[PDB]
Design a protein around this ligand. Structure first.
Ligand SMILES: [Ca+2]
Ligand SMILES: [Ca+2]
Length: 153
């Protein structure tokens, strides 16, 4: 996957998984598959549902353990955009970067959040890169609108 799943995300998937597994009586249909992807904040397309349901229903033959489930659904959860997430959760994400709660993400606050997300330290040069990429109003910090875009296509 693009990056490692956070503990809160593993719990989101665990919850999706219980729903998936209750629903699954041998096989899984698209209404069900779709709904428990929604349980984890992701709106699938019917194309996606057909692919996924065929994988689950033919290849694994209905035997999906949590590990299988995370291989399939992991990427989708990581791929959620701003408009699926909702405001309160975006707010929360932002919070987590804005450790001092002053409504602005400082370049060292970015550094820590990036370290925690990617699971390794990020270079001085790279973090400077990110800011210039991200800051619309050219004040060297990251605010909420700025941060939302960072997760918007
Ligand atoms: Ca801050
Ligand atoms: Ca800014």
């Amino acid at each position: 996957m693009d990056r490692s799943l956070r503990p809160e995300e593993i719990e989101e998937l665990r919850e999706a998984f219980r729903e998936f597994d209750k629903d699954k009586d041998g096989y899984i249909n698209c209404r069900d598959l779709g709904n428990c992807m929604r349980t984890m904040g992701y709106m699938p397309t019917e194309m996606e549902l057909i692919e996924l349901s065929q994988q689950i229903n033919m290849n694994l033959g209905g035997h999906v353990d949590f590990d299988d489930f995370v291989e399939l659904m992991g990427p989708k959860l990581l791929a959620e955009t701003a408009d699926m997430i909702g405001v309160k959760e975006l707010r929360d994400a932002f919070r987590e970067f804005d450790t001092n709660g002053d409504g602005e993400i400082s370049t060292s606050e970015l550094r820590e959040a990036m370290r925690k997300l990617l699971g390794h330290q990020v270079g001085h040069r790279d973090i400077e890169e990110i800011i210039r990429d991200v800051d619309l109003n050219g004040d060297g910090r990251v605010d909420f609108e700025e941060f939302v875009r960072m997760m918007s296509r």
